[PDB]
Design a protein around this ligand. Sequence first.
Ligand SMILES: COc1cc(OC)c(/C=C/S(=O)(=O)Cc2ccc(OC)c(NCC(=O)O)c2)c(OC)c1
Length: 82
Amino acid sequence: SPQKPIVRVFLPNKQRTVVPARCGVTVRDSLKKALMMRGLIPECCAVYRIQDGEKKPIGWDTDISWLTGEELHVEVLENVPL
Ligand SMILES: COc1cc(OC)c(/C=C/S(=O)(=O)Cc2ccc(OC)c(NCC(=O)O)c2)c(OC)c1
């Protein structure tokens, strides 16, 4: 059976969108869909994932195919020009 890897990203506002683990693709591109589907932007959003009872912040250049099997969650970095 064709193996399907995904990462379930918990979007802002406690929603979630899953993105198929893209090999050779960064959190940037994968999450780019994730945010954009909600109408949000990866610019003012951060990627975190919970490890041993704690939080580990993720880098946008991180190959998302390592993060397969995990549930992610994005943290809104509110630094708007307001
Ligand atoms: C890899 O194989 C897939 C098969 C799919 O289908 C057969 C979808 C399908 C996606 S989709 O068209 O359902 C848009 C989508 C997906 C998940 C969501 O939450 C978990 C939301 N949440 C939106 C909200 O709640 O605001 C939106 C896929 O997506 C990556 C992957």
